[PDB]
Design a protein around this ligand. Structure first.
Ligand SMILES: [Cl-]
Ligand SMILES: [Cl-]
Ligand SMILES: [Cl-]
Ligand SMILES: [Zn+2]
Ligand SMILES: [Zn+2]
Lengths: 21, 30
């Protein structure tokens, strides 16, 4: 999930918008 | 090991800024 995708490598703002409602 | 609890604290503050008024659901379990 988000923890797997964004704690070992950085997630940009465009990647993190994937998790918004 | 990667400390998922400390990373999660930061990821929820980043989601707060990126999602704004849309909001978000945060579920640790994968
Ligand atoms: Cl930290
Ligand atoms: Cl982040
Ligand atoms: Cl950040
Ligand atoms: Zn920290
Ligand atoms: Zn960050």
């Amino acid at each position: 999930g988000i923890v797997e995708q964004c704690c070992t490598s950085i997630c940009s703002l465009y990647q993190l918008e994937n998790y918004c409602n | 090991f990667v400390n998922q609890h400390l990373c999660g604290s930061h990821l929820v503050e980043a989601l707060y800024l990126v999602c704004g008024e849309r909001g978000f659901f945060y579920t640790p379990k994968a």
